Ligand binder design. Structure first.
Ligand SMILES: Cc1ncc(COP(=O)(O)O)c(CN[C@H]2CO[C@H](OP(=O)(O)OP(=O)(O)OC[C@H]3O[C@@H](n4ccc(=O)[nH]c4=O)[C@H](O)[C@@H]3O)[C@H](O)[C@H]2O)c1O
Ligand SMILES: Cc1ncc(COP(=O)(O)O)c(CN[C@H]2CO[C@H](OP(=O)(O)OP(=O)(O)OC[C@H]3O[C@@H](n4ccc(=O)[nH]c4=O)[C@H](O)[C@@H]3O)[C@H](O)[C@H]2O)c1O
Lengths: 363, 363
């Protein structure tokens, strides 16, 4: 059979149609479809303002930039995340303060966050990992208590809910429209916020810092209507798309009961899982093989897998900048985690092909 | 009749088809179509390496970043240009050194460049204005003599030639795939260079600074294959598309002989005009009306126009940062220039509608 990648975008007739209307219109860059997408995300989350951007990385950049973060400022973040967050902190001239995460949910804890707080802390950046939400009640309380803004990394959390409310409903959250995200337009993102002054700054910084004329220099991070229209078509399918992911995640849960591999633990609080990823831990002790070996073997069997992620602080630049930094739970998982196939268009043929491969390598 | 904008993208069946193959493929982000586009631009220009990016602004950012430009460093650039170049210089922490341009070609002169050179100069950034090339022989000589890298702003110059050779054939040039550019994919750009070490740095800085792992923090500026495929379809039509622009520019030249308005002067050297814009000067003295009045009147007649550009140093942030800065030729034109309709799909009905409007407001 053909290669089974660990993810595929759910592109259909709606996506192609959306593009066609934009191309035929002549207005292919930022315009009406961007306004519609922003208005739509406000309706999805329950928030008041939304700013569409070229990527969630870009969203993180202008979000932190809008806060005036720079020299001498600290930003608390997990090491277990995508390198984008760490890079934007550094490139702004600020100091990344990496903290550890829960050993089984891979989510940053209020404990580890609070212990790292200093008068130089200008932001706390939690990650709604794999689609599951973090402990926002506790983390928000830390923010209001110490007076530190909270910028939520919701790159995995489109459709995620935390204690009855959508992620992005309150505060500030940054979603991703990357190829493998729940909804996609190849590359894109959106910042949702409740602060009108903050939103105006984002809107400015994403487009040359114009109002027109330059008021304060900004970057070019605007999302074309070409892509926005695709993200809109996807957003209409969101509940359906996530339902498929959820259904498949359930089937994984069953098969894993008779497998040595350890899926992530669900958060203890009320939530709705967007199921962007299905991560398993591969401990050589109880599995008989290393995670690297498993990924190489699955590949031989024509099955793709992901690595989300190898901790940022174990990568070259951050190894050399923070030699002393130790994060045991982060490091433990980082050496053992990998992402199994999970995408809306995945079939039972595809699913059973994975489990058959997993039993074959185990034993 | 309907509104006649001053530009429209030439979207056809090829563009829609290109998108469809990408969507159907499942690989919608950076991939094969990006490689093809880079290889194609190398074939167009005659250069050896090309790096596709999310925008020409983004290209300018990583280009200057790759040079190590930062605190204390100066960058010579015209004020008569798009605010993007000035913003990227500043946001890097470097100092923009704005210099004047030729009164009739709006191109930066070797004279003004050389006079502003100092041991802090780390880059010279000429602009191939409106599609016409700058005096590269002189400017390159300045670069090699003083040991200053030259980064060419070719946002208007896709298809432009200078003394028998394509723009981008040598050194470093940054092209734009913006909506109104000669070729477009809504938003996009590409850096073409002859330096292999330099190109590797760009390739890294446009994608998180990865090789993988982070070697040195970078931004997210990668172009999706979705858009790259559109840029490829356009690139195949380039000569045809520019021929239409050129043909229309010829018709403007005729009508302007019997009009008080002053088109830009052509460069004195051998060249091929890409004709991205057709700019005219509107001097209240010999025209009877101001440029602002003309644009407002043409709009009433359902005819759109452009302003490329109001000098960067007359915009708020740069007014306050450089109060003493005076650039007479830049300022003179900046108050009098505007861009008339010019796009491949423009008809004779559209053209004659402009000239009829121009004679009506003159007299
Ligand atoms: C010298 C130089 N250096 C760097 C850059 C930046 O490159 P980059 O942009 O790739 O990063 C540029 C690019 N600048 C261009 C891009 O940004 C600006 O363009 P813009 O914001 O759009 O607005 P306009 O000029 O006035 O054109 C808009 C019109 O156009 C019509 N229109 C507009 C959009 C659309 O989708 N369809 C359409 O018909 C439509 O008719 C619309 O009215 C500049 O004016 C343009 O000149 C540059 O000229
Ligand atoms: C917590 C957090 N914060 C911020 C961000 C950044 O957001 P932003 O990206 O919007 O700026 C992210 C996003 N990170 C994602 C984007 O970048 C990385 O993705 P990636 O570079 O692609 O590679 P992979 O993960 O391994 O997936 C690739 C696979 O996927 C398959 N594939 C790939 C492309 C495609 O077009 N089609 C396809 O089937 C195809 O099967 C391919 O093999 C991360 O791993 C992804 O997790 C994040 O997770």
């Amino acid at each position: 059979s053909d290669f089974l990648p660990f993810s595929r975008p759910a592109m259909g007739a709606e996506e192609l149609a959306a593009v066609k209307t934009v191309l035929d219109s002549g207005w292919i860059t930022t315009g009406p479809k961007n306004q519609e997408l922003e208005a739509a995300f406000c309706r999805l989350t329950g928030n008041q303002y939304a700013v569409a951007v070229s990527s969630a990385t870009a969203g993180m950049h202008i979000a932190l930039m809008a806060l005036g973060i720079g020299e001498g400022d600290e930003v608390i973040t997990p090491s277990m995340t995508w390198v984008s967050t760490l890079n934007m902190i550094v490139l702004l001239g600020a100091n990344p303060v990496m903290v550890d995460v829960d050993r089984d949910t891979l989510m940053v804890t209020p404990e580890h966050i609070e212990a790292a707080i200093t008068p130089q802390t200008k932001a706390i950046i939690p990650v709604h990992y794999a689609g599951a939400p973090a402990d926002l009640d506790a983390i928000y309380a830390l923010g209001e208590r110490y007076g530190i803004p909270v910028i939520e990394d919701a790159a995995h959390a489109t459709g995620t809910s935390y204690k009855g409310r959508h992620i992005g409903a309150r505060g500030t959250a940054i979603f991703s429209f990357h190829a493998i995200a729940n909804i996609t337009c190849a590359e894109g993102g959106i910042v949702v916020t409740d602060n009108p002054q903050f939103a105006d700054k984002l809107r400015s910084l994403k487009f040359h810092g114009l109002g027109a004329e330059v008021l304060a220099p900004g970057y070019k991070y605007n999302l074309p209507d070409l892509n926005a229209a695709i993200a809109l078509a996807q957003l209409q399918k969101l509940d359906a798309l996530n339902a498929r992911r959820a259904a498949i995640a359930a089937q994984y849960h069953q098969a894993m009961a008779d497998l040595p591999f350890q899926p992530l633990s669900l958060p203890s609080w009320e939530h709705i899982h967007a199921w962007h990823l299905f991560i398993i831990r591969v401990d050589e002790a109880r599995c008989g093989i290393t995670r690297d070996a498993l990924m190489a073997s699955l590949k031989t069997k024509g099955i793709g897998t992901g690595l989300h992620f190898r901790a940022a602080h174990t990568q070259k630049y951050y190894r050399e900048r923070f030699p002393t930094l130790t994060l045991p739970d982060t490091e433990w998982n980082s050496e053992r985690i990998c992402s199994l196939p999970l995408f809306p268009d995945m079939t039972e043929s595809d699913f059973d092909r994975v489990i058959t491969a997993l039993h074959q390598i185990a034993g």
